Amino acid sequence: KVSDKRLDVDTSTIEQELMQNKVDHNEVEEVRQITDQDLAKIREVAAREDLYSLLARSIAPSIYELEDVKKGILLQLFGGTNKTFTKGGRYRGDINILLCGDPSTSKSQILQYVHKITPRGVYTSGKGSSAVGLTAYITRDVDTKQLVLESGALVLSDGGVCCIDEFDKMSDSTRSVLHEVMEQQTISIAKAGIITTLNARSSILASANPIGSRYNPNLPVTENIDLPPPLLSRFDLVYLVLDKVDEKNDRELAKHLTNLYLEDVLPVEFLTMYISYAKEHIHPIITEAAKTELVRAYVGMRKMGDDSRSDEKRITATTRQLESMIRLAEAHAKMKLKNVVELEDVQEAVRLIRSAIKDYATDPKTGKIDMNLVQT
DNA sequence: GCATGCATGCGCATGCATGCATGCATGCTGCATGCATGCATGCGCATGCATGC
Fold it and tell me: Strand, helix or coil at A3?
């Protein structure tokens, strides 16, 4: 139940299976062994000055793309801190990302690469899924000829990543089931034979196609994506991938691609090992200096566009954005092996949230993007 | 161009013509008993012949 090239399962979800294995004396090993030379290497690299760039660079070493896009995948892999209350009530740290933008980009490869690095996952198309196919169903076993219950797409993705491609092409009936999985990370089934609540602790990675040929900078974002504006606010990060014609970016991309048809970064093994180590041992906790900045940032974000709320030009800010900042600060702290979330983490989180939506080039009144200011 | 109702396939649940073994009981039938009958047998007695005297 291990592989060098894939990540280790989340121990936060299998606590009692570990206890049962010891009571049953089965030596099936779930997590991998770490020698001390390799653990010394871990801190030797974790001390490096350019850790953040190096990690972002080694995520997908064959996708010439902005490092902001890759950093989101890197922080999605680490995940937020899972918190358990002793009076019932669970808070989880799963990150949800949307990749909107023109076609003819490398969004598709990101989803495939993330499918193949995460231990548990399922790949779904837009107009190829049903509610029954995502939740559960009853089937006839050709061996015993009786009726048994079988798991669905989202329940099989418990403690992993689920990749939904062409999210905008999906029916309102099928989009209905995702609300509960994005709110409470559960599913409630009341069908003939089963009345129970299931655990779906999964990360959502979705890509959407813009209306018409290309993204139109002259129109607002709410008019370019066929998705209700209220649904757009449930995602932690929204990535606008825009295409601009610029001669030195094109030159670099062409050389990059042609170099692959001939005959520093961290190899796959070391990357996965580092991520598993961090996800396994350390646990970050927030401080007051971070709380001040979090509250200030949320108030500042809400105060913006207070007048531009009746008209759906920009995406209105809600409490889920506050929770997104919390989650991203905790993930950035987990990277670099700290147990303390300082002010740098919150500043980086807010920087990333604004940079994803391209808020450094938007007219706050007409929701339009100046492409002369969108630099590669 | 937007809103609407119809007809087209999914996705459940139930009934239904085929088909074959098992335990109980039916229904016949081969077997054992009893008996009538008529032909042959194993027998002792009376007659007629042959052999002395």
Answer: coil
Helix (H, G, I), strand (E, B) or coil at A162: strand
Nearest to A316, CA basis, from A326, A305, A325 = A305
A310 is in an annotated binding site: no
Rounded Cα–Cα distance for residues A108 and A119 (Å): 19
A84 CA → B53 C1’, Å: 163
Distance CA A77, CA A75 (A): 5
Give the other-Cβ count within 10 Å of A236's Cβ.
Answer: 25
Whether A129 has a binding-site annotation, put simply, is no
Distance (Å, whole) CA A242 – CA A245: 10
> A360 and A373 in contact (C-beta within 8 Å)?
yes
Provide the β-strand partners of residue A191.
A194
Expressed in Å, this structure's resolution amounts to: 2.8
List chain B nucleotides near protein: any atom < 7 Å from a Cβ: 10-13
**Using only C-alpha atoms, what is the Rg of chain A?**
22
Six token digits for residue A91: 């808070």
Angle (nearest 5°) at CA A270 between A264 and A275: 115
- Chain centroid to Cα A331, Å, comes to 11
